[PDB]
Amino acid sequence: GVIFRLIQLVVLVYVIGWVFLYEKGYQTSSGLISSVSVKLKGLAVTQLPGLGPQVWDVADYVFPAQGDNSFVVMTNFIVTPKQTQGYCAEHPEGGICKEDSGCTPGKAKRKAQGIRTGKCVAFNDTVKTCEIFGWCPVEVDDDIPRPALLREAENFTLFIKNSISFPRFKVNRRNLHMKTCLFHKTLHPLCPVFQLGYVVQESGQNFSTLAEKGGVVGITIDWHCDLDWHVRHCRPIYEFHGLPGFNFRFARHFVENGTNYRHLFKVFGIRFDILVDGKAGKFDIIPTMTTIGSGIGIFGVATVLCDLLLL
Amino acid sequence: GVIFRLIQLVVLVYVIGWVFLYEKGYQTSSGLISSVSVKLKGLAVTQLPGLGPQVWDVADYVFPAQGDNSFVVMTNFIVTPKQTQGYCAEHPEGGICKEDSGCTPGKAKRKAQGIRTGKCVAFNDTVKTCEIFGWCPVEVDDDIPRPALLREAENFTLFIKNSISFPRFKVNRRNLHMKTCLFHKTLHPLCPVFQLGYVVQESGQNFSTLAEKGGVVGITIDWHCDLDWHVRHCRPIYEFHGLPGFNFRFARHFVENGTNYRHLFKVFGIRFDILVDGKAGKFDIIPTMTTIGSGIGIFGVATVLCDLLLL
Amino acid sequence: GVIFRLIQLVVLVYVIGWVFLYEKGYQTSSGLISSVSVKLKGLAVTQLPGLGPQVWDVADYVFPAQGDNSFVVMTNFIVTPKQTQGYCAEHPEGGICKEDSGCTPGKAKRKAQGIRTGKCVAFNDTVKTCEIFGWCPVEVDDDIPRPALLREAENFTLFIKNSISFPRFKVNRRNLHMKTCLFHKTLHPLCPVFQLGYVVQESGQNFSTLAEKGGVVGITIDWHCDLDWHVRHCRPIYEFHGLPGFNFRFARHFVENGTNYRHLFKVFGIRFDILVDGKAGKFDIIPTMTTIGSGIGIFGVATVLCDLLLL
Ligand SMILES: CC(C)CCC[C@@H](C)[C@H]1CC[C@H]2[C@@H]3CC=C4C[C@@H](OC(=O)CCC(=O)O)CC[C@]4(C)[C@H]3CC[C@]12C
Ligand SMILES: CC(C)CCC[C@@H](C)[C@H]1CC[C@H]2[C@@H]3CC=C4C[C@@H](OC(=O)CCC(=O)O)CC[C@]4(C)[C@H]3CC[C@]12C
Ligand SMILES: CC(C)CCC[C@@H](C)[C@H]1CC[C@H]2[C@@H]3CC=C4C[C@@H](OC(=O)CCC(=O)O)CC[C@]4(C)[C@H]3CC[C@]12C
Ligand SMILES: CC(C)CCC[C@@H](C)[C@H]1CC[C@H]2[C@@H]3CC=C4C[C@@H](OC(=O)CCC(=O)O)CC[C@]4(C)[C@H]3CC[C@]12C
Ligand SMILES: CC(C)CCC[C@@H](C)[C@H]1CC[C@H]2[C@@H]3CC=C4C[C@@H](OC(=O)CCC(=O)O)CC[C@]4(C)[C@H]3CC[C@]12C
Ligand SMILES: CC(C)CCC[C@@H](C)[C@H]1CC[C@H]2[C@@H]3CC=C4C[C@@H](OC(=O)CCC(=O)O)CC[C@]4(C)[C@H]3CC[C@]12C
Ligand SMILES: *[C@@H]1O[C@H](CO)[C@@H](O[C@@H]2O[C@H](CO)[C@@H](O)[C@H](O)[C@H]2NC(C)=O)[C@H](O)[C@H]1NC(C)=O
Ligand SMILES: *[C@@H]1O[C@H](CO)[C@@H](O[C@@H]2O[C@H](CO)[C@@H](O)[C@H](O)[C@H]2NC(C)=O)[C@H](O)[C@H]1NC(C)=O
Ligand SMILES: *[C@@H]1O[C@H](CO)[C@@H](O[C@@H]2O[C@H](CO)[C@@H](O)[C@H](O)[C@H]2NC(C)=O)[C@H](O)[C@H]1NC(C)=O
Ligand SMILES: *[C@@H]1O[C@H](CO)[C@@H](O)[C@H](O)[C@H]1NC(C)=O
Ligand SMILES: *[C@@H]1O[C@H](CO)[C@@H](O)[C@H](O)[C@H]1NC(C)=O
Ligand SMILES: *[C@@H]1O[C@H](CO)[C@@H](O)[C@H](O)[C@H]1NC(C)=O
Ligand SMILES: *[C@@H]1O[C@H](CO)[C@@H](O)[C@H](O)[C@H]1NC(C)=O
Ligand SMILES: *[C@@H]1O[C@H](CO)[C@@H](O)[C@H](O)[C@H]1NC(C)=O
Ligand SMILES: *[C@@H]1O[C@H](CO)[C@@H](O)[C@H](O)[C@H]1NC(C)=O
Ligand SMILES: *[C@@H]1O[C@H](CO)[C@@H](O)[C@H](O)[C@H]1NC(C)=O
Ligand SMILES: *[C@@H]1O[C@H](CO)[C@@H](O)[C@H](O)[C@H]1NC(C)=O
Ligand SMILES: *[C@@H]1O[C@H](CO)[C@@H](O)[C@H](O)[C@H]1NC(C)=O
């Protein structure tokens, strides 16, 4: 008879501890719908690489300007100035040629830089490359600037505004001294102002390296909230992680004397992805009663098996 | 014996009414994957503030132009024209100085506007401020235009196209007289063309105030759909809510006589976030059978307790 | 007695096969949080329509340049060159007028193109239209170019980088010869480089038609992963589907001799939406024990009913 008492004990212990108190089996879970607003702050100066000092404001190093959940902060770039649409020699990458016979008119099949012509022109004092129609002069992105141009982006600040809501429960929570306040994993774990160097350091990456050629940093805001407790306990955890380099080409188009030109930029930047996930639970009677009924059922399959086995 | 009959009654009532008929405990829930397309319509004119009439088209007051789930409609702005990169006095905010001793060469630690120099120059006929290298002339954003410049944005129309799908069930639903049709919470509750003034009014905010200095308006499309009923009943509910002001700085870069300038804009706008959440349920046999088994289990723990207590 | 044995059989078969082995009722499900990076590749040339050859690079035909989950690839456009803000005749759409009496000063109520004036001016050698203040000359978008200008966009390549994570289980999965590798539904079903023509073909749409006037193509990455098996089996399925045309107006602003102009573009493009959904299950003891208890419960309601009915 003691064995049956022990069986009833293990099941009660399982049902109360594991099902209810440990895993919150008495609760009903809901996700959230969230909105994120990011505001960058800081100035950058590129003294030597800019041929005289050059200043980069928020209107310049943040893509997009209006902001988004995923945004890029430029940390380095190569600029091809005054590119016009006309005839020019292509990068030796397109292929080095030493006669007009090699050149084949028409667009190339791989790494096309324009429309080739049956002509060979000098790329510089040594290499002769196939003439093309396209944006000229052609870009040279081989030499990535090192050290990075916007290496002061590590001291920029990132202010994140997050407004979530658990629609099933009608609970709405925002994530906001704090003006002159900076986030530290432990010392200041609830201050929504982040420094980019610190964010990159917490993702496990080196800002010097992830600057000189770009990268991706994913920021996660975790709202794990037990709505049985007061909503004042519903607080966010900021989790930093890295999701080769990140680069993109953008072009500033301008007109001079009736002709359309453009400044081509190859932007090596850090793409920030603010991911917001959360689980809110609150007591419900249906899961509670379901767990107790299934538990009485396990008592039966256990007691009967023990008795039948004993018999 | 009557007590046992009553206990069997309460449980049947609970299981049938609350578990099944009220909370749809016989069903299996699925979320959705959605796509939103927004198309703005309207023109704005800024007669007096623009130094002669000025017209703002969709290509201008919507950020981004291509559209997105979250977009900004400019309602007011401050423009700093022909900013070049050169030497100039900084905003008195950087700090008022009355000699060259105060000026400290190098970028400042807080609110840096450029690269200071050991020189003091006149900001105007009274204040003398530290000379800086940066975009000049410097911006003055203290005087926010009131009334708003694009106060006609309240009469712009917002056409939202939403295409959802409940992938688990393979059900795809779109949210579309209606051309000349406008949405009213009650009179016209299914017309996807919204007027910005009405959307802001339904979020609880005043458009005059949320125009002069910006704001955030969140639009939610709720697809709560019972797939036991015909898909023609699967319809969206449009829920408007507000998620200080919203502002961003963008720059139009142009070239004049070989020199790079820019028009700096401080945009006070209303950011619209189209959030689309939904729950689709359809009958499943597993939850139904689970609910009945747990219910037979509760009958046991109830009948036994009553009998044992009576004994 | 045989009937009771058969009843115990049907329930065991149901519980083991349908509840556990078929529907994975012994498991616990988790969604995912994902990040998508898209990189376009290709060049386009518009020989005849461009009044001499015209070249379109990635910096030009992709909106936004930095990339996003939802992006637009321009396939056709109408350009209104050198639009200045001044006085001009409006499109005959605004309304044809044959005197000054018809013209009514002030902005129109529908399809407003500017600020009308009590004057009538000639649109061309035949129609006389109401004079307006606005961006002039006015746009004429009636004639959509056919064949499309960027009809070579079908041979552009779309490289998608997807990094998901199932946060509940702490499992992180990315979706990556493959450099010169192209995706085919069956032959190459795991190569993340897609060709736009093929993507559009797999959505059921014709690229010639969805080019000449735009469209929407939705790309879904499905991560259905059984974490009982090794993570090497957790792989993505690429599902292509179409979510009238898609068009947007963007403006390149430039300055000439102190005057602000703009190039107005009406972009007919294909909007790509990368939707990433997934379900990860892993064995849990709570659902397993819940299913067995409810099953013992069904045995009871079945055996008792059979006996009572027999009696
Ligand atoms: C084990 C089987 C046979 C069922 C018998 C036990 C359950 C009825 C117990 C176990 C765990 C209990 C839960 C543990 C914690 C809480 C949080 C508690 O939170 C509050 O509301 C307290 C603060 C406040 O009063 O605001 C409310 C009760 C609840 C849901 C308890 C409800 C009763 C539960 C489900
Ligand atoms: C063990 C047998 C007799 C079955 C009963 C199960 C118990 C383990 C349950 C029954 C009542 C439960 C308690 C009911 C209410 C609360 C208050 C609850 O308080 C909060 O968390 C609220 C805090 C806040 O409001 O911020 C903490 C759990 C506790 C002690 C529960 C712990 C688990 C208890 C003791
Ligand atoms: C209470 C315990 C002991 C179980 C006994 C009752 C259940 C078997 C009942 C209660 C609620 C019923 C559900 C209530 C509503 C509907 C919607 C109904 O929808 C239709 O398909 C009707 C329209 C059509 O025919 O297309 C289908 C049956 C269903 C799922 C019912 C299935 C049978 C359920 C689960
Ligand atoms: C009460 C005891 C005897 C146990 C049986 C539970 C009942 C409460 C269940 C059994 C059958 C159910 C019915 C089965 C089917 C339908 C049709 C269903 O119709 C729809 O919703 C379909 C409408 C559409 O197709 O658009 C509405 C619920 C109803 C009446 C159900 C209501 C609940 C009922 C009566
Ligand atoms: C039918 C009722 C009375 C319960 C009795 C049967 C269950 C205990 C069985 C049925 C289906 C079984 C599952 C079927 C498949 C798997 C995958 C299997 O995956 C592995 O881990 C195998 C590979 C490895 O060793 O890494 C682990 C056991 C599990 C979860 C099984 C656990 C035991 C289950 C739940
Ligand atoms: C039928 C009665 C006696 C109740 C027991 C239920 C059975 C149907 C269960 C019990 C053990 C289960 C097995 C336990 C473990 C595995 C290994 C599992 O292997 C994998 O999927 C792992 C592969 C990998 O690691 O990549 C496949 C299911 C299987 C055979 C299960 C199939 C279903 C079984 C036989
Ligand atoms: C002319 O251009 C070619 C091509 O850029 C130069 O050759 C490159 O030189 C660098 C530096 O040594 C190498 O890293 C590259 O591998 C070379 N490219 C090729 C295709 O050989 C060449 O040096 C240039 N000539 C001058 C005088 O500047
Ligand atoms: C010169 O510039 C300074 C700084 O903008 C002006 O001082 C400001 O005046 C306004 C209007 O009274 C006040 O609201 C600000 O608080 C003042 N700022 C500071 C730092 O004192 C000053 O008025 C300007 N002088 C002239 C003649 O225009
Ligand atoms: C002057 O402009 C009007 C308006 O665009 C032209 O009339 C259009 O002509 C086309 C071609 O036949 C028709 O498809 C449109 O329906 C006409 N519009 C209207 C409002 O009638 C007219 O042809 C132009 N005149 C010249 C000489 O070019
Ligand atoms: C950021 O500020 C610290 C403060 O000491 C400075 O040492 C560092 O050089 C700054 N980062 C730059 C300049 O990139
Ligand atoms: C990595 O970061 C450290 C500072 O944390 C820096 O000193 C080092 O130079 C970085 N790595 C490289 C290769 O420079
Ligand atoms: C501007 O273009 C015209 C037309 O080609 C040319 O005659 C003129 O010399 C150009 N002016 C300058 C300053 O390049
Ligand atoms: C919007 O239209 C109404 C129509 O009467 C007008 O009164 C109102 O002034 C308009 N909103 C503006 C001009 O901002
Ligand atoms: C609030 O809105 C009303 C119209 O609904 C307007 O009359 C009022 O002026 C607004 N508030 C303020 C402070 O102007
Ligand atoms: C254009 O720049 C050159 C070089 O500084 C200068 O000589 C010339 O006067 C400038 N022209 C005008 C119109 O400013
Ligand atoms: C894409 O490449 C194929 C290769 O044969 C070519 O036939 C086709 O014309 C190309 N698509 C264009 C040019 O739009
Ligand atoms: C549809 O696509 C086919 C090629 O798959 C093409 O030949 C045909 O012209 C397209 N439809 C139309 C109306 O052109
Ligand atoms: C530039 O604008 C000024 C001021 O209107 C005018 O006097 C001058 O002729 C213009 N120059 C050209 C080349 O249009």
Residue numbers in the entry:
A (entry chain C), B (entry chain A), C (entry chain B): 30 to 205, 213 to 279, 287 to 354
From the article:
Our high-resolution cryo-EM structure of full-length wild-type hP2X1 in the apo closed state at 2.7 Å resolution provides key insights into the subtype-specific features of this receptor. Briefly, mammalian cells overexpressing hP2X1 were incubated with saturating concentrations of NF449 antagonist prior to lysis to prevent binding of endogenous ATP, followed by extensive dialysis of cellular membranes to remove antagonist before detergent solubilization and reconstitution for purification. As expected, the apo state structure of hP2X1 has an empty ligand-binding pocket and a closed pore. Residue S337 from each protomer defines the narrowest region of the gate in the apo closed state, constricting the pore to a radius of 0.4 Å, which is too narrow to pass dehydrated Na+ ions. The architecture of the TMD is a key feature of the apo closed state: the pore lining TM2 helices (one TM2 helix from each protomer) are arranged to form a closed channel with the constriction gate (residue S337 from each protomer) near the extracellular leaflet of the lipid bilayer, only 7 Å deep into the plasma membrane, as measured from the start of TM2 (residue I328). As a result of this “shallow” gate, the overall shape of the TMD in the apo closed state structure resembles a “teepee”. Consequently, we observed density for and modeled two CHS molecules bound per protomer in the TMD of hP2X1. The two CHS molecules occupy a cavity between TM1 and TM2, at the interface between the ECD and the TMD, located on what would be the extracellular leaflet of the lipid bilayer. Finally, the succinate group of the outer CHS molecule creates hydrogen bonding interactions with the sidechains of residues W265 and H269 (3.5 Å and 2.9 Å, respectively) located on the lower body domain of the receptor. Overall, the apo closed state structure of the hP2X1 receptor resembles the apo closed state structure of the hP2X3 receptor, with RMSD’s of 0.8 Å across pruned atom pairs and 3.1 Å across all atom pairs.
